[PDB]
Amino acid sequence: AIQSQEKGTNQLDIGILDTGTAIGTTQLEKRISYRDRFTVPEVLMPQQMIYFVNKDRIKKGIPLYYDVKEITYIATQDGTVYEEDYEIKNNRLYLNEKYENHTVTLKILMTLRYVVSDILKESRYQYTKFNQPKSKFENLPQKLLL
Amino acid sequence: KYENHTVTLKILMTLRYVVSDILKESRYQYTKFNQPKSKFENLPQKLLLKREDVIVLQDPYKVNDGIEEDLEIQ
Amino acid sequence: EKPYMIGANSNPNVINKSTTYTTTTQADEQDKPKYTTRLEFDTIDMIR
Amino acid sequence: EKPYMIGANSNPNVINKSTTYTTTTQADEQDKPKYTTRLEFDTIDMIR
Amino acid sequence: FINDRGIKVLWEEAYFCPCLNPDTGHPRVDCPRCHGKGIAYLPPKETIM
Amino acid sequence: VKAYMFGIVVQNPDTGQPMGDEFYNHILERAVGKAERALDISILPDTQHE
Amino acid sequence: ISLNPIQDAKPIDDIVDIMTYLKNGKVLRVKQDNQGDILVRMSPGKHKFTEVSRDLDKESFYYKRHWVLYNVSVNSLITFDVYLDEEYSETTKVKYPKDTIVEYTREDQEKDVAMIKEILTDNNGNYFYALIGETMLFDENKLNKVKD
Amino acid sequence: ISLNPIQDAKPIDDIVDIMTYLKNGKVLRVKQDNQGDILVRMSPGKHKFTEVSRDLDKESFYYKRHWVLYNVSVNSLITFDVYLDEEYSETTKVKYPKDTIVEYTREDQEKDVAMIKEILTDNNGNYFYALIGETMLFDENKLNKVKD
Amino acid sequence: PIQDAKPIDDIVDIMTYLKNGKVLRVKQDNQGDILVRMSPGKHKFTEVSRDLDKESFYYKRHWVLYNVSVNSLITFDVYLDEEYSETTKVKYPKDTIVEYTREDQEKDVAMIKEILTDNNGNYFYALIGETMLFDENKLNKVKD
Ligand SMILES: [Zn+2]
Questions:
Q1: B42-50: which pairs have CB atoms within 8 A and are 24 or more residues apart?
Q2: At what angle do helices H15-24 and I11-20 cross, to 10 degrees?
Q3: Cβ of E43 and I62 within 8 Å?
Q4: Beta strands in chain E (DSSP E)
Q5: In which domain of life is the source organism classified (chains G, H) (predicted)?
């Protein structure tokens, strides 16, 4: 379970940065650790980015700041771009020679992801005894600050 | 007539907003009741909106429809 | 004389009805009232 | 003519049913309605 | 519920204009897509919010 | 029937369809039929061979 | 086999005639844009003052109008159309009033626009329309209105 | 001792024929991916406009479809399969439609893939399948589908 | 006659030309003119442009996706972009409310049925319900 999901944006001299709090609650018997990692394939997140092309980047392939699931919209100074002119491999982008010194921008969808930055109300406990041969210890859900 | 005069105006303008943060950004439900199979639905986002004062752009150029409003039919 | 009968409907069909926007105008108007009960404090009892 | 009888079941077994994901597309759609009661303020009473 | 309590509003998505200067990384003062702002916009989509 | 239901529209909730006139006629024919027994009458004109 | 033509409620534009009628005490009906239709009157007797009533119907033995003092504004009269209450009535809320330009289909399958010069009614309460340049009177369904 | 073959509802790909049918006024049925199956129609009379109905069944004396004005998009037609409402029906929701490649077990215990060229039905409503290169018609249980 | 306009009647012809890929010009009411186009490549979808001028070394059109409505096409007037004429220098546009006087000295309103000119540039106008031609002065532009 996940709650309070926030895409907190800080605009600074270094640039824009995405950071926010998301509060999660696990199942029983699971002992999460600091800086564990989660990824939610179901949920996709929109991002926007821009890159500048040169005679060197055209052949190597543009290294993307984000990951890729699918592309929503591409554009450049000459207008939009079609599927016949671009391809993506191993999370880097290739373009044909028509855009040697053009700019390129993309609206992109990426999988939601989280890391455990603190463990909060970390352990809750019950000596379950009713309808058991003997007393049993069960660890109740942790709360995670993602 | 007003070459070197001052001029002042009380003006009405359309309300406008920009998304300065996305908050409680995603809420989810595996809707299964009365469905052939499990379905995933994204529930409403909450947006923290900000007014457009420092930089102003005109209203977007929407494509109009030729259907007359309040049209009689018979 | 003749019996009073409902007869047929007369309302025509209307499509794509647009909303009404209150028009801005500097002219005066009159505020349409409602006459009904009023609520007040018991100021005498407040003094008490 | 013949009596109407239930007979046998026809639904086959299905295993490992995957969820449905709404597909992203730039194309237009139409938002399936529900016609029912609407709640509104009594703005006249608000004026009062 | 949302269609009931909401207000009609035009939703237009945002994307960085190609006119950005490749070296400084800052936009042209005037161009058709974006009027000095470094972010352009797509066609609007009618929406209730 | 509609007149007595002045201000009420009978409409499907999940689609914009109103119920047609045929249903009303079908109901009305059963309404007059029920009345014809409830007071032992023959109400519409008809020829009888008795 | 018909009824004679019915006059439309002429709006009054000149403020001078409005004030003269008011001084004579004849009732006026003001179509306010924001808050509906109201009646305006001059108080009888020596204590002259303007009065308003929202008892928006013709006076009747069983329905007597109640008048409240109000400070009616000149600008309100000027910007809002005003009618004599003796004329303005539910009798004929015609879809296409007199002097209105309407689109009508001619026998040659060519749509033309003409201004309604005369309107009358018949036994059934229909609205017969007279258009300039033609003698035959059209019906409600045949005609059409063009706005803006 | 059987029933003659049943035609499948041919999807329409060319936009030109779709528009021509629409101009003729013939009903269209659009399978929207996100929000189900809808009907599309051109308004009769002079005031031409597109209309939509979700009264998703064949028209009947006891069940009359209600049409709402809507601004149907060209892209919607192009990207979504569209069928003539005279054809698309519950009559035969065959598991393996025509032109579908299906896997069938041959008498030599060697599984082969063939494309269904003809489908028919019998008294019990079964689905007899014809496969290219063979004359005997297979049954539903024997066959299998291979996806991707 | 004048060759400044060649409106398309059938939407079927419009779709046929769109399949051929030729650009179209679509008028609006109290609003800017629009150009419409079909996207090339694998995926087919409509595209629009707010620009109108011809493409050149100093001027390039901008295209974006839009869910164009068939209602606009069927209702609004449509032309081929390449063959469109910017303006015909006449006082009154076609399909405009005008006032005139009939043969019996009776005043009547009408809309312009045809716009014509002679070889010397003198412009004649024909109104609905009037076969004869009218001078520019004899007409009157009715106020909305
Ligand atoms: Zn720009």
A1: B42/A43, B42/D22, B44/E2, B46/B22, B47/B19, B47/B21, B47/B22, B47/B23, B48/B19, B48/B20, B48/B21, B48/B22, B48/B23, B49/B17, B49/B18, B49/B19, B49/B20, B50/B17, B50/B18, B50/B19, B50/B20
A2: 180
A3: no
A4: 8-11, 14-16, 39-41, 45-48
A5: Viruses
CA angle H90, H92, H93 (to 5 degrees): 80
What is the token pair recorded at A127?
């000596």
Residues I56, I49: Cα–Cα separation, whole Å: 15
In the structure, ligand 1 is a single-atom ion and the residues with CB under 5 Å from it are E 17, 19, 31, 33-34
Q: Do C15 and B71 lie within an 8 Å CB cutoff? A: yes
* B21:A4 CB<8 A: no
**Which residue ranges of E make up the annotated binding site for Zn(2+)?**
17, 19, 31, 34
G39 within 8 A of G52, measured Cβ to Cβ: yes
Q: Which of residues 39-58 of B touch A (CB under 8 A)?
A: 40, 42
Residues 6+ apart with CB under 8 A from G147: B68
Task: Count how many Cα atoms sit within 13 Å of the Cα of residue I96 in the half-sphere of its side chain.
Answer: 16
Residues of H in contact with D28 (CB under 8 A): 71-73, 75-76
- CB-based contact C16:H69 (threshold 8 Å): yes
Structure-solving method = cryo-EM
3-class DSSP state of G7: coil
Question: Which residues in chain I touch residue G112, judged by CB atoms under 8 angstroms apart?
Answer: 110-111, 128-129
| Distance from Cα I44 to the centre of ligand 1, integer Å | 27
Documented resolution in Å: 4.3
Q: Which position has the token pair 């001619």?
A: G106
Q: Tell me how far CA of residue A102 lies from CA of A49, A51, A97, in angstroms.
A: 15, 9, 10
Q: Give chain B's end-to-end CA distance (angstroms, integer).
A: 56
Dist. CA H26–CA B13, nearest whole Å: 47
Residue with tokens 């059409």: G144
Ramachandran area for residue G88 (φ above 0: left; ψ -120 to 50: alpha; else beta) = beta
Q: How far is the CA of E32 from the centre of ligand 1 (A)?
A: 7
Q: Rounded to 5, what percent of chain F is helix, strand, coil?
A: 40, 5, 55
How far apart are the C-alpha atoms of A35 and A114, rounded to whole Å?
Answer: 9
Residues 6+ apart with CB under 8 A from A5: A20, A22, B24, B25, B26, B27
| Residue the block writes with tokens 């309070």 | A4
Rounded to 5 degrees, φ, ψ at A43 are -90, 125
CA I12, I18, I19 angle in degrees (round to 5)?
90
Q: After which residues is chain C broken (C to N over 2.5 A)?
A: none
H109 Cβ contact partners less than 8 Å away, ≥ 6 residues apart? none
- Chain B CB within 8 Å of residue H48 CB: no
DSSP label of A66: S
Q: SS3 for B66?
A: coil
**What is the C-alpha separation between E37 and E33, in angstroms, rounded?**
9
> Nearest CA of chain I to the CA of E49: how many Å?
20
**What's at G146, amino acid-wise?**
V
Task: Tell me the sheet residues that pair with I23.
Answer: none
Please name which of E46, E45, E20, E23 lies closest in space to residue E34, comparing C-alpha atoms.
E20
For chain H, the straight-line distance linking the first and the last C-alpha, in angstroms and rounded, comes to: 37
Residues of B whose CB is below 8 A from D19: 30, 37-40
Measured between CB atoms, does D46 come within 8 Å of chain C? Answer: no
CB contact under 8 A, H71 and I69: yes
Residues of chain D numbered 23-42 and touching chain F (CB < 8 Å): 33-36
